[PDB]
Amino acid sequence: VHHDGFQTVKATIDWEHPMFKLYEKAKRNGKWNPADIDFSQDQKDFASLTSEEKISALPLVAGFSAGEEAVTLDILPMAHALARQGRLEDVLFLTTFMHDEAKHVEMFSRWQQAVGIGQMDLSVFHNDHYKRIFYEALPEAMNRLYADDSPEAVIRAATVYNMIVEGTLFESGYYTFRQIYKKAGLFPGLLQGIDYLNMDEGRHIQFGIYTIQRIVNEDERYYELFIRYMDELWPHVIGYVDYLTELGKRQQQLARTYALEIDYDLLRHYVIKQFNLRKKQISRT
Amino acid sequence: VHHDGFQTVKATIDWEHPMFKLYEKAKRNGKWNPADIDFSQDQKDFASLTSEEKISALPLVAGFSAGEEAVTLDILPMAHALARQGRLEDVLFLTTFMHDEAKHVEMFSRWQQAVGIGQMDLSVFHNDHYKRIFYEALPEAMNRLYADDSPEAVIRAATVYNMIVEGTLFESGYYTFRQIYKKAGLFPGLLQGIDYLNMDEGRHIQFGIYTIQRIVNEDERYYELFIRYMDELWPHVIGYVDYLTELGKRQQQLARTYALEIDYDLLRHYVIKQFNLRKKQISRT
Ligand SMILES: CCCCCCCC(=O)O
Ligand SMILES: CCCCCCCC(=O)O
Ligand SMILES: [Fe+3]
Ligand SMILES: [Fe+3]
Ligand SMILES: [Mn+2]
Ligand SMILES: [Mn+2]
Ligand SMILES: [Mn+3]
Ligand SMILES: [Mn+3]
C-alpha cells in the first residue's frame, strides 16, 4: 500500500528516540566479522577429541545453529509491523538486529565447516520441546504480525523472541558454553565468536524490553499477558534443559578428561534465574 | 508457518553462492558511519548562500531523502519472499542491503538537521511523476511479494527497485550532485556521504542483476517481461527529470555565482544512458 509521506522529508529522525540511540550503539559496537575469526586451533582441538568427547559438544551447537537461523528468518515480520506503524527509529535499529543475526548464523556455520562436521546433520539433538519453541511457537508468533499487529500480538512476539529465545535460552547456553570450554581451554575461536554474539544480544534484549514496556505503559493489563506468555513457554524451556542435562549426564567423558565438575544443578538454576530476571525487567506500572 | 528444518544444521552455508560472496564484500566495505561525517562546513556553506541559491539544492535532497526512506521500508518484502523460498545466502546479503539503506536515510537526515532545514517540509519538490514511482509503483511492486512470489513478481520488484530507482534515478542523481557541488566546492560532508552511498549502491544493483538474470536463465521469455517493465516506468523517470530540469532552468542563480555551465542536455543523456545500460546487464540467453 502507498506511502502518504516520509518523515525525513517532512521532519527529521527523532534523534532522542531510545531505539535511535540503540541503533547508534549497534553501529559503534557491531563491527566484528566472523570471517576474521581463526578457527585453526578449533579444528585441531576437535580432531584431538575422542568420539565420545566429540558428542559432548554437538548438542549445544545444534541448538545454537538452528536457533540463530530461525531468528534470522523470523525477525522480519517485526520489522514489517513496526515499519507499517511508522516507527522509523525502531526499523533503523532492527536493520542492525537482522544483520547481527546473519553474522551469528555465519559464525556457527563457519565453525561447523572448520572442525569437519558440516556434512553432519545435527537435527537429531532437537527434541520435541526444542521443536515446539523454534520450529513452531517462534515462527507462529512472529508471522502473526503480518496480519495482526495488535498490542497483544506484539507483546507475544517480543516475549517469545526476545525474552524467551534470546533472554533465557541463548543467555543460558552462552553461560553454559563458557562454563565448560573456557575452563577446558578448548575451542578458542568459537568462544571468541560467542563473546561477540553475547554483546550483540544485549541490544536485542533491550529492544524487547522497550517494546514490551511501551505497550504495558499504555495499559497495565498487558503486564498480565506478558507473565502469562512467559509461563506458557517455561515447560518447553525446561524440557529442553532437562533433555540436554540427560544427554550430558549420559556422556560424562569430557568432564572426566578435562577435570570439569559440570554442575547441572547450577546450570538449571541459571536458566530459572534468567527466566525470572526477564520478568523483573518489565514494570507493571 | 513452521520451519521444516535448518540449512546450517543439516549442512552449512553455500560458501560459493554469489550472494554469499556479495554479503562478504558488503561487510568488508560497509563500515562507514554517517555519525562520523563532519557537517560543520556544510552548515556554513548553506548559511552563506542567498535564498535563491538555497532553493537550487533542495529539490535533489528532497528526492534523495524520501527515496532512501522508501527503499528502507520497501526492501523488507523481498527479504521475506526469498527467506520463504529457502534462499539463505540471499537473505544474509539482504541484511546488509537493509542496513545500508538505514544509514542512507540517516545520512540525509543528519545533513538536513545540520544545515538548518530539518523543520522544513521538502515534499513540495515531489511532482506527480515522482509520487507515481516512490509513493505508489515501488511499494506496490514490493508488497505484492507477500502474496505472490512468482518469477514475474520477483522480476518486477527487482526491476522497479534495483534497476529503475537505484540503477537509473539514484545513479543519475549522484552524478548530478557531483557534477554541480563538487565543482562549486560546496557541501563537503554531503559529498563524502554520497560517495559512500554510491559504493553501497553498487552491491544493491548487483543483487538486482543476479535476481533478474537467474529468473531469465530459467526461461528467456522473462527477458521480455523485464524490458516491458523497464519501458513502463521510463515516462515517469523522464517526467521527474524534465520537472527538475525545469526547476533548475528557473533558478539559474547558483550556476552564475559558482561559474557552473550546468548542462541539462548532458544530464538528461546520462539518465538515458543509465536506463539503457541497465537493460544491457541482463542477457536474453
Ligand atoms: C543446561 C542449559 C542449557 C541451555 C542451552 C540453550 C542452547 C540454545 O539453544 O541456544
Ligand atoms: C537531472 C536528472 C536528475 C535525476 C535525479 C534523481 C534524484 C533522486 O530522486 O534520487
Ligand atoms: Fe539475538
Ligand atoms: Fe540502494
Ligand atoms: Mn517432555
Ligand atoms: Mn507530466
Ligand atoms: Mn543471535
Ligand atoms: Mn540507498
Numbering used by the authors:
A (entry chain A), B (entry chain A): 2 to 286
Paper text:
A related group of proteins with a similar Mn/Fe cofactor is termed R2-like ligand-binding oxidases (R2lox). Following O2 activation, their cofactor catalyzes a two-electron redox reaction which results in the formation of a tyrosine–valine ether cross-link in the protein. The tyrosine and valine residues are conserved in the R2lox group, and the cross-link was observed in both R2lox proteins that have been structurally characterized. Both proteins also comprise a hydrophobic channel leading to the metal cofactor wherein a long-chain fatty acid molecule is found, which coordinates at the Mn/Fe ions of the cofactor. The mixed-metal cofactor in R2lox self-assembles with the manganese ion in metal-binding site 1 and the iron ion in site 2 if both MnII and FeII are available.
The latter mutation was designed to create a cofactor geometry in R2lox more closely resembling the R2c site by blocking access of the fatty acid ligand that co-purifies with the wild-type protein and coordinates both metal ions. In A171F-R2lox, the fatty acid is excluded from the active site because the bulky phenylalanine side chain blocks the ligand-binding tunnel. Electron density for a hydrophobic ligand is observed further up in the tunnel, but it could only reasonably be modeled (as caprylic (C8) acid) in the oxidized state. In contrast, in the oxidized state of A171F-R2lox, E167 is a monodentate ligand to Fe2 as in the wild-type, whereas E202 adopts the oxidized or reduced state conformation in roughly equal proportions. However, cofactor oxidation by O2 appears to have taken place regardless of the E202 conformation, because an oxo/hydroxo bridge is clearly observed in the electron density in the position occupied by the fatty acid head group in the wild-type. It appears likely that in those molecules in which E202 is in the oxidized state conformation, a second oxo/hydroxo species occupies the bridging position. Accordingly, the A171F-R2lox cofactor can adopt a geometry which is similar to the oxidized cofactor in R2c, with two oxygen bridges instead of only one as in wt-R2lox. However, none of these structural changes seem to have an effect on cofactor reactivity with respect to cross-link formation. Judging from the electron density, the cross-link was formed equally efficiently in the presence of O2 in A171F-R2lox as in the wild-type protein (inset).
